[model samples]
Target: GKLDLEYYRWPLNNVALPKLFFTKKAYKIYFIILVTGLLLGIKTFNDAAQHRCMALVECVAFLWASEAIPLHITAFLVPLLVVLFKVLKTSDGAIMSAASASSEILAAMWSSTIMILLAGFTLGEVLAQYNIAKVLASWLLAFAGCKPRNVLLMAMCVVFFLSMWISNVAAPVLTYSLLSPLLDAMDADSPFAQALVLGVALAANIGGMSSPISSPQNIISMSYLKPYGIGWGQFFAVALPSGILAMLLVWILLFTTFKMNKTKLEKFKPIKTKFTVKQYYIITVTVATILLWCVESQIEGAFGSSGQIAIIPIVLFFGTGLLSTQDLNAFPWSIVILAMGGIALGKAVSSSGLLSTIAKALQKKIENDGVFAILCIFGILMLVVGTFVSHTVSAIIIIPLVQEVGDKLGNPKAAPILVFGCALLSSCGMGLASSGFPNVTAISKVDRKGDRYLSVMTFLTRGVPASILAFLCVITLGYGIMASVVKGN
Candidate 1:
């Protein structure tokens, strides 16, 4: 547990350390109050301290890792909570970022929102309606067996793999839902099955961290740092390793923690996939479409924003006749709107002086800390705070700030650390059943026979240890991997 920290390693320590020291216990209590207070104040911008919160309060850092309370909700609620509580002072002497630049936030939100909407709703719908998802699910099902835990593992792996592109958060519903009934038929009422389902949920959350295409958070990470020329391949150089580790950690931890019904586990039989040729064609199209989006930066250089790259599908959606006007009725419009709104709002929040202010503050805090402290503080903060909020919102809020923090400390490669911190903290031990969508949906379906329904507390108890183990894994295995791979742009 000893770190060879290079002493806040900044050649020029920027901010003068406050001479007034709080005792360790006092600091803990202070942090508890401060974080709790800041958590309240963050969202409540007023006329004077709109972004500042009460001047008596300083700043709070992000806890990067998570178990889904749905990042969107966290992002929405935390900020609102700040307003509700008047956590920030209002009497008039507070210095704060001025009114948000609404246009920029709106633009960022729409751009990203459009990207996800197109991919998740239009592109994903085209694939699913034509039976492409089932086709993929059947292919995935052919590998592992009938054991519930194994079933969960295989489903999760498939989701994780798909998430690298399809983004597990959005991709696995069809597959997970298909498997859930089968598990229930075997014994849905069993605790083991419930745990297995929880594993599937956990897998989806972890899978998103592995690639740029995996989640909006990853996209946001890139968008926040776009001015620096960091790309998917570069993002992957760091993300791919830690992400693989996150997935593997979930698999091993879930496997060891829960005893599987291996004896009863049936060998995977490749059932005859019932999709028509059209379905397969659409599936191929969607996969190709995603591939194009990832590489679009290379082909369509000088694009205004990565958001425009989404035209690849809209154009192809018509060119290949993937989804006809007749099939238009099948589109998930509500989800589409939700995605659009989510992206728009999130983007607005990012552009809103909110993120930049936080970014500047983070720059000041970690200005002199070495990579070890940066990683540790970032990891711990994300893990703890993420339990209650959206890692994406926190990330959207924090990455800009973290990068700023990194630069202040004379380390320009802060993006990589922020990237790593966002990822590593997320693996926080088997977070819980509802850390994300899969767990939330999966557990809700379980007619629990015992007292253990998946709650935030349960997540913390479970996730805390899982997070700790995963952190250790990253520290031990992750460092060498990052050292060999991370070369920031």
Candidate 2:
């Protein structure tokens, strides 16, 4: 309607001509990749666990990276990284050389992934126990009061906040549990719930990058950051500032889009639990366990050791026990497939050398310039990379492969910085409104009017400019500031 000064699109938005042919090829390749990955995965299961490890990395990579495929299947990519790296080490010169790459990645993946899962279980799982998340929703109801739309903005806030801690999926998982009850209590019509869908889904996707724990991007980053000794303390500092900015960015967007969505403010009954002290114990243990993971290095020794190493299986072991085996069985199977399988697959991608090989294929042409040039190039690549790539696949390639490039440039420090930035901020852009299970699932659960006005398309209308601003800010803020603070450490 008005004269638009900004080209005003996400970087990759302009592809003068559509690649319909490549789209076809992508589908063909995707089908072959899936069938082969499946066949290989079947064979992988039959082989020694070690090779199966490698096979899993390949399968996961093929599956997740297969652009034409609709599934954001991360279970497939993990095995591929693990297996490929293993084979490459054994097959190539200087086992020391091959083994070395394994060192940074292996422990990184182990620590990052496990810690995240534990933290998710501890913080989210517990609060979820007695509908603490529900009590929180009453706050949203209060904020919106009698009006549903204002409450949607509050939904925007909670999802954004939780994402920095748990993940977009977990964020919505948290959001849905709380809001769904309210919706049912309100008895929202299907059309009403559907109307709220886009806003809820898009908020989940957009909010995810606010913290390292928000999604696989963080896992990938934590893995990449470990070698630099970017521990939880350091990582949180990096994430918190940007996360705050990111969340506000999302909220502001929501505010503008649904100004009419304001609700009257009112107090509501807080959800309370009749569950016993035993339940309280479960919740307490969960939070304590996560705090331990985030700060395990302190000899102050609050929770003991990093939960990444020991907490998940142990806490889950007990937590799951609290529930009958039947209750444990009720846990979503897809998540299990993703979590356990995703880890296995990540290890395999490293083992197979496929990731390195892929990086090598692009290295000469793509990674040869100076930092600014290479960064500009890489950042552009990330935007393009993100549009077509799922979160897990993007992490697999961008995280580790970027590590190799950083090492080669004699500026290994720059590697983690670039990749992690990609993990945190740039990845958020990809989700627009359709981020994933977390986003879509959360959207399904909440019912707020005026919320429908807040979809990804609207996000695109403003997201690009804010992202450009945020991207510049993150580069200076994440890398430049940190470099000064930790110089020569």
Candidate 3:
């Protein structure tokens, strides 16, 4: 039965069910964080220069963490706060001069990355429309040898491999579209179904950490390390091994967290499926796109951006008469705007000098704690931040801050610390739905009964533990094991 509609809000008033419990205390805590953040800036900083910057970040952080405002609304507030506070510009410090003190933040907010996210949506929409993922899943599961645990293993492996080439969001959307029916075919409330659904999204997020072209974080790390003459192979050698292990650990963690018959296969039969010529084209072109993404490093400058590559599917799908330009309008703009807000938040932190300022504060800590201790501190911190903020924002801040700290330590071996920390912590720490685009996208696929297949509680309960397990994998396999291979000669 649905909850009483009279109590719900507009629009979602129809779609959303009332919460099981309401708490005034959650709201109270939000305003508390807001006021404390503002005061810390007002009282702690020497001037409004730093105060304004710190306050804005603090405000955004609280808003994001608490979900006090719609997250995108909080994101929009970022540029406004910069403009209103006159913080985005300064002769020196984190501010910059633009249009004689205009909204210089606009261009960064209207980033190409926003378009890239849109392209991901368009691709997801088209792929789902044609049921490409469903067709593929049937075949993949057929190869699972009628074993239930092997079914889960194949599902995770497929998502992991595909995510290594596409946006994490795209990978899960495709995988979910493909596997959701199979999951639905099982007991909807079964531990197996829940584990597989969550695991696919988890795999998508984890897979991107393995390669430079797989995600923006990896790309940014490569850019940061370029001045050090770090080659892709050297970086890949460390990340790939760690990433593979992390995926394995994540698979095991999901099963362990949820109950399952370990030795025998479950009773659900595989769905046999077929494909069309048009479907074959999408499969081929999508493969081509993945190939391009994989080798994009070798041909670095030839292509423009992931957006351009993402559009290939849209164009080819439209050209083949499979989808329409009008279908483009159906793409979810909310997710895109949210992505922009995430990027803007990252930019705001960088431009405001908040990240650098925070990084500098660690100097004394590093001196006191030593290199390994500092790595442990930041690694743990990254895990927490990654859980609350979108990994995109988490990576944006963690990557540069790590580079800064690494330089201060002057340790060449610290590169793996940066690499593993940036990739694993950011991707693995999806303890909340809001932690990443893929996480949110997957969580939104609610059933007709107004129940999420994976709830916020489920996400935290299951995902956080998986994140911790993956974090250890990175520390042990990614950083400790691979650092020796990637260290400076």
Predicted candidate 2 versus true structure: per-residue lDDT over 351-394, tens digit per residue = 44444454455667867676555555555555544433345655
The sequence of per-residue lDDT tens digits that candidate 1 reaches over residues 1-489 is 964332222246354443334345445445556665665556655433334432212221221123123333433333333334333322353432223233332334344434544444466556555555445555555666555556666777766776677565445554444453345344554545645566666666666777765666676766665665557675676666765676677667666665555536545455575666766666666666667555644665665433465565666676677667765565434333333333333333332345445545555676677877777776666665454334566666666556666555555566565565555454442353333444444444433243333444444544556566666656656666665556565
Q: Could you tell which candidate, 1 or 2, scores higher by TM-score?
A: 1
lDDT of 3 by residue, 160-190 (tens): 8877776575677667666754655565466
> Residue 300 lDDT in model 1?
57
For candidate 2, the 10 contiguous residues with the lowest summed lDDT are 443-452
Candidate no. 3 TM-score: 0.79
Q: TM-score per candidate, in order?
A: 0.60, 0.55, 0.79
Q: What is the descending TM-score order?
A: 3, 1, 2
lDDT of each candidate versus the true structure: 0.52, 0.51, 0.66
Best by lDDT: 3
TM accuracy, model 2: 0.55
Q: Which numbered prediction scores highest in TM-score against the true structure?
A: 3
Error at 122, model 1, angstroms: 7.8
